[PDB]
Design a protein around this ligand. Sequence first.
Ligand code: HEC
Ligand code: HEC
Ligand SMILES: [Ca+2]
Ligand SMILES: [Ca+2]
Ligand SMILES: [Ca+2]
Length: 278
Amino acid sequence: TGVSAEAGEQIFWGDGQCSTCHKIGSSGSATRGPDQEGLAERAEERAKELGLSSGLEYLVESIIDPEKYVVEGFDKIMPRVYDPPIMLSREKILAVLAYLQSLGGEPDLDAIMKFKDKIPEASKTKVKPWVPPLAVTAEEGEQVFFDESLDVTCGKCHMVNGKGQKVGPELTGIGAIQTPQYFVESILEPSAVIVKGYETVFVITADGIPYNGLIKSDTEEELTLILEESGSVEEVVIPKDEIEDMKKQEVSIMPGNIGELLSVRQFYAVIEYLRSLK
Ligand code: HEC
Ligand code: HEC
Ligand SMILES: [Ca+2]
Ligand SMILES: [Ca+2]
Ligand SMILES: [Ca+2]
């Protein structure tokens, strides 16, 4: 579809997967990454703060090296879209850059094209194929994911295609977005990266009762928390009028010892299942 902001718009809201994490004002609803309304202008300020030549160069760096600068309030979750699974082509990345420039600025085709030699080509990815050290299948991993007899059951907290229970983020489609390495880290180091909005809050009530958990819903009268203990969850409804203090914490309620609770085979099977969620 060429290199234009119009082509980039289709890619941002399509095969680039950008809109699975980013919204643009009232367009879209994803909150995993920052709202990109006004991105063109704040890229200019990012560039000045980071010593880059231009806002456009900051946009390029944000795609090719997402870890290099981490926007305040977020964790290192953005994938390299030129790598698997997304495998976004170089022309499509150039198009996306034109679209990003149109978010409060002017697309500059000549300037974008000069960064072509900095964009890795998806077909030339250096990522090695993912080969588990045992024969496992996605179907085997699906069974593990929903197995209530294990000491951890992913389906107690994660929904996939309408099955499971909504505590953490729905995992439908995540295999089209994230890497196996991200799945490994998410399972074995769950608080290393916290999906935005799924932070644990520490609550103290006026009667001095502590409640530590994930906010399920936040209304004018009531705060509903999900508390976790040893892989089990429970809800508490706390009247807003009784809340003395609330502090967000950079920790996840996803159990921190899953490496002790899954076998090698169950672990690699569940990763194959996640990879398969396209
Ligand atoms: C689809 C190809 C895209 C594009 C064009 C962008 N993203 Fe993301 N992104 C995500 C998170 C958590 C952050 C903040 C942490 C960090 O800086 O890495 C970002 C950041 C950006 C930026 C910089 C924004 C700024 O305000 O400075 C830009 C330009 C950007 N992204 C573009 C999260 C995600 C995803 C979650 C898994 C996905 C998918 C994408 N981003 C995809 C894209
Ligand atoms: C069973 C072994 C699993 C597997 C395979 C996953 N989970 Fe969880 N998870 C929970 C919460 C609150 C979050 C968000 C906060 C955080 O980032 O830790 C997550 C996150 C994930 C991810 C990342 C998802 C993404 O969109 O990037 C993945 C891949 C993941 N989990 C896999 C909560 C829970 C639980 C509540 C007690 C339980 C049990 C699990 N998760 C179990 C699993
Ligand atoms: Ca970044
Ligand atoms: Ca995590
Ligand atoms: Ca209890």
